[PDB]
Each structure stands twice: as structure tokens, then as C-alpha cells.
Homo-oligomer: A and B are copies of this chain.
Amino acid sequence: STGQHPARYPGAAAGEPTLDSWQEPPHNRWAFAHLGEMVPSAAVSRRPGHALARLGAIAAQLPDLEQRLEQTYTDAFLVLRGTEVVAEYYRAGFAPDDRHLLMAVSKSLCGTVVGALVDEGRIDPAQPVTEYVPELAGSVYDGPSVLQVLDMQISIDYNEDYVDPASEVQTHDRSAGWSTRRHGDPADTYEFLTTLRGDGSTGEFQYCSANTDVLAWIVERVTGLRYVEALSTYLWAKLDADRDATITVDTTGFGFANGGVSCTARDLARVGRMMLDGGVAPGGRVVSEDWVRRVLAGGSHEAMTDKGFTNTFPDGSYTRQWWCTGNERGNVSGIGIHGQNLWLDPLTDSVIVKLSSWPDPYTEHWHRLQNGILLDVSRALDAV
């Protein structure tokens, strides 16, 4: 058992509706107004081809920028200096207002929601995960603190070989609906999390997407809100965003917090703007000044043993769902596979959003090229 979860709608029974019951009362009143949450759906455009390149200023300092963006399978690119959009790029076929999957940049959004609840005193990072989700007792999450989940400093037996269906990575996707279910798979994401085990050691960084879903579960238990709603209430609805964001949901309606959010590049930049504004957004304060300060400060360097990150950023670290480069510019970034970045450049009070679709989830090759672009663009914003 995974305990109480926020009902899909007011008064809904646990796990209702399902793909086989949404047309039945009393579920249909809700389902008829949110069918996309139950059945894959396509947009029928209200609007009746070519790449849009408006790199403005930085174009002079980076003459071959568009080509570099093409080489890194860039779909959407936007630079926000202060409150102004100073550079934009959208591939042919991708409109400026189209939404794009954020992959793990979604994690930084989840950490932000947790941060908001910490400010309210609803979540104490020093407390064990089980203080909020007792059902995780007996799992790898029995013992570690919420902060250790936030900083991903929990050793977990997590097979990362996607080529193997038995791997935890593939199983995580199947449990959430990102891939076709197989006989024996956990019923939902909550159940999947309870099956995770580890040797009990903590303190060393281990990137694991399951950690973020545990954070979302904690958010639900402390607020009583579906993660989908909590993400809106504590973050999205305060950004004065142009469009709603979307998030994939599993069979119980639980949002895939670790990587299922989609939004426009301009709106994602509003999240960065909030971080560079001490945690304040147009609709109100999202997180405390202290939380933002802690994110920019970075996590323990000693815990960061991922050579894939430290080879590029020797003094890098990770904290509260954000990757911290530890470079001379103090760059911090939300990162997602296939080339997604919500890059913060505090020195120039700028935010760089790059949403892409590399053929591979991750290779040193793509990261070298991607980071080269983000760093060059950041430097191009320096006063001269």
C-alpha cells in the first residue's frame, strides 16, 4: 500500500477514474473537461515552415551561433537579459509559443515547489522522508532526510541500462506511462518508488530521477494537492506565464515530476528570472531569498563524484535539484537529457533557455558542444 493520495477530483475514490471508467458517473463530469489526462490527444490549431532567428546583439560576437544551434539540434533558444528578451531562435516547424518537453529541467521546478513549502514551514529538510511518507518505510528512502533527496545524496541500486527492460530506468518509465507496461510492473509511480533499495549509505551524489518523484510525493502529503495543482499554485500561477505548462501523469493522475513538464521557452525563462530576482515572481514570492542563495551557493563539492560533470566543471556540485557549475561565473543550471537547459548567469542578470532534441540522451560530445554555447553566450553578455 502507498497510502493516501490526492483525489483526481473532489470526492473521487482512490485511483479513479481509470482509462476504463472515465465515461461513467460520477467521473465523467471531471473527465469530460480534462480528457487529455486520460487519453492521448492532439491539438487542432486555431491558426492557419522556416526557422526564426533573432539573435540580435550577440550575433556580432557569435557570428556562427545559428549554425551552432542547428548542430546541437536546437528547437527553441531564448536569452533574457534582465527583463528583456535579447535573443531568440526557433527551428523550422517550432513556433515561438509552442511547448517543449523539459525532461529533467522539470526537477528544478519540483525543487522550487519544495522550497516554497520549506519557507512556509510545511517541510523541514532535516526531517526523514518517512516523516511525510511513512509508506516509504522499508525502502531505500527509509532513513535519508528530505535534504538528502533534494541533493540526491542517497545510494540507490538503480540499473541505468535502458537496453534492459528489467532496469530501474525502464521500469520507472513503464510505471509512469511513458512506455508500454509489462506483466509484473508496479501499478503506478508511488508503488515503483517503494520497490527501490540501496546499501544504506548516503552523502555521495547519485543522480536518480526517482528522488524527484519522492519529493513530489512529499509535496502531495504535506499540501493535500495533486502535484499537478501544487506545481501551479506554488510556482506556475505566480509567473504571469503566457501559457499553461503541461505535465504527463500516470494512471493515478500523479505528475511525472522528474521529467514530464512541457512549456514555452519564454515561460521557462520566467522561472530563471524569478531565481535571479531573489525568489520573487510577478504573482508573489515563490521561494525565500535564502533558498535562492543556497541554490546559487552550490552543494558539497566532495559529494559530487560524477566525472561527466566535474571533467567540465571541476568545482561543480548539486543542490536542491539544480546543477551548480562552480565556475568563475557561478553558473547554475537546470538540465535535462537530449539538450535541455534553464541556465542562470547571475553576473549579467541573464537567463538562457535552450530546448533541444539531440538524437542521444547524453554523450560527452553533445555536452561539450552545448556547454560551449551556453558559456560563449553568457560571456557575450558581459560589459565590454
B-binding residues in A (CB < 8 A): 18-20, 23, 25-26, 28-29, 31-48, 73, 75, 94, 98-101, 177-180, 228, 231-233, 236-249, 253, 255, 260-263, 267, 283, 338, 355, 357, 359-361
Contacts and interface: CB of A to CB of B under 8 A. Distances in A.
Contacts of A20: 179-180
A262 to B, nearest CB: 6
B42 A40 contact: no
Contacts of A283: 48
Given A41-B37, A179-B19, A180-B19, A237 B46 contact: yes
Contact of A42 (B37, B101, B180): B37
Most buried by B among A18, A23, A33, A361: A33
A246 B40 CA distance: 10
B237 A48 contact: yes
Given A39-B177, A46-B241, 8 more contacts: A18-B180, A26-B359, A34-B43, A42-B248, A44-B244, A44-B245, A44-B261, A46-B239
A170 to B, nearest CB: 10
B247 A42 contact: yes
B178 A253 contact: no
A28 B244 contact: no
Given A46-B237, A48-B283, A338-B28, A100 B41 contact: no
B33 A98 contact: yes
Q: Is the interface of A mostly helix, strand, loop or mixed?
A: loop
Q: Please tell me how many copies of the chain the complex holds.
A: 2
A238 B41 contact: no
A129 to B, nearest CB: 24
25 contacts: A18-B180, A20-B180, A25-B359, A28-B357, A29-B73, A32-B100, A32-B338, A32-B357, A33-B75, A34-B42, A37-B40, A39-B177, A39-B248, A40-B249, A41-B248, A41-B249, A42-B253, A43-B228, A44-B228, A44-B231, A44-B246, A44-B261, A45-B244, A46-B267, A48-B283
Contact of A246 (B36, B47, B238, B239): B36
Given A25-B359, A46-B243, A48-B283, A177 B75 contact: no
B36 A236 contact: no
A40 B178 CA distance: 9
Nearest to A356: B32
A190 B225 CA distance: 40
Contact of A99 (B33, B228, B267, B359): B33
Contacts of A255: 42
Nearest to A98: B33
B42 A39 contact: no
A19 B19 CA distance: 16
A45 B180 CA distance: 28
Given A33-B100, A40-B36, A40-B248, A236 B45 contact: yes
Contacts of A25: 357, 359-360
A355 B29 CA distance: 11
